[PDB]
């Protein structure tokens, strides 16, 4: 039995190897709430603690705001819910104790938390794989394999699709753990020797460098940030063999193509192409350095420390070779990327009149060449599009025409992104599936210095997914209480998120997105009109809304992860998404095979179209979110949280400020908040008696009636009866009660 043999590798790499004072976690600087020091408690009141700081000073904290340290027996628990003092620095502390012993996987209730070790740990060998084949969560130690295996067994046993919601930015090990999930499924889903899903495993993983190049960018927070969300399906036939894979992509931050904030970058692919292309490629596409393109030079950043964009281009090209893109398709792909940049170098100049003119036509001709369109047709389609009056030319002014040029750049880039996913799906999905195990990968919760419409949609997606988690926790907790016949009554945890979701997207009262859709069609609405309408509806009316005293262009939303303030500039223009038909007819006529598909395929083109009208981005956004949540509610969900230990790519250096910030955003701390309100610590009686038979007189270590023996210990210790409940198999304890009993045990054996 490797699981029970303590000489085994399983116990060496996945299990834990092992004073009287009381300490408390505290913040030396209260403004830095995630940086903690340990302090000794010295005095005690009815309402407070007094503790010594590391420098020897004395401090008072009210007992209701104190983050007590857990007794050492709690150090290394496989589930955070096993901690008695369940608070933020105590949870981080448990993570540190396990990280320094190379235990990178820890449960937090339903969550599997995975911290990137920045070093190879030998826990993914085939012997390891064998350990987890067929095992349930509580039979083995925390491991990504355990989540994969539980999901696989339930898929066949319940004949139900499964979802795996996973969070983590570049550097947290999310890509690695997703690859581990795929390879574990592939290992057990096939025959032990003759499984034949080797090519598909290669193509799924090689799909990632491609969408990373076109969909990831450098933000102020991360060098490789996913500006789109995706759902990856591991598909199975009815017998449980891997049958294929699919990728579903959600809205992309196409506004990033035309605009980047200071010190940020456009999507990687532009810098890869300009840096990695051959001399004959550059001339053919009329390329220059990033400095020479307005779409790449407005930010002051064109390179990433320690990232070679030419080397990255060869990796992306190689990836495209592998997933099936032909040389003709790859060259058309970069013609489009090259064309987009050329489009952005067009300078529309103010003519002597209302309409705009184009003095220099160099950029227009360079774009028409690589796109395969007629420069004159494009020129008029941009500056003099035709509308209807039972077709009427309409001369446009400068920014009216620059904005339509931008709209073409966004539509071109966005449709190209959808086409890449469709092409990758072509080699990944060649069989109708029976079941799927789906990996959800959305842009994580975001707080920039200036947060705009995109951030409200991103954080709203996380807000609804955190509620999805909270409701699932609720039903599993109810199941646990009645199976134990614990008389405790809690309301649905999902409803704590409901105020914030109603504020963003409710129907009556109308939420922010509905008020935005309304203002977008009101003739003379501005952004000032929009935010005023927002304040009128919500300031001092929705409890999660805030009208700031300081600024007149910002509104605040209180998410599960904290408060975020959104600047309202350009929300109406961002919500409106037109493309003039003259532009679309001009590119339907193109001589390039890939470009034509972008405007002729009713799936790539005609995306969220509405009978000769384009719907709003908020409308497009709600459509995708509602369909995702519908798919998700049919599945059995599992949750994985990937964490960056630090920002220095360093092994064995876990930093509280870095880690804690992520656990707030990814929902783990929200789950902690709910767990600590109830009865987290649940002990089988015989175990409680065995540990604490010596705190009460005349209690045998192995009592026949442990229920009675536990009541003896609790009564003798004068434990507050409000702090525990008696189950049929276990005793339920409130936060802190088990720690005090543990302390009492320490002192008594201290004295011995
Ligand atoms: N569990 C792990 N064990 C060892 N190395 C890891 C693990 N997870 C991630 N890494 C390493 O850390 C880096 C970041 O991984 P990851 O975040 O998954 O990739 P990306 O940055 O592309 O998202 C990679 O170079 C990988 O080698
Ligand atoms: C399930 C779902 C549905 C819609 C989504 C997302 C996920 C995202 O994560 C994003 O892909 C992150 C970028 N983004 C976005 C960009 C511009 C405007 C609105 C949303 C997203 N919308």
Residue numbers in the entry: 2 to 19, 30 to 401, 404 to 765
Text from the published report:
Myosin is a ubiquitously expressed adenosine triphosphate (ATP)-driven motor protein, producing force and directed motion along cytoskeletal actin filament tracks by converting chemical energy from ATP hydrolysis into mechanical work. Despite their specialized cellular functions, all members of the myosin superfamily share a common multistep mechanism of force generation—the chemomechanical actomyosin motor cycle. The myosin motor is thus subject to substantial conformational changes along that cycle, traversing through different actin-attached and –detached states, eventually amplifying them to a large scale rotation of the converter domain and swinging of the adjacent lever arm in the force-generating power stroke. ADP release is key for the regulation of the mechanical motor function of myosin as it controls the fraction of time the motor stays attached to the actin filament.
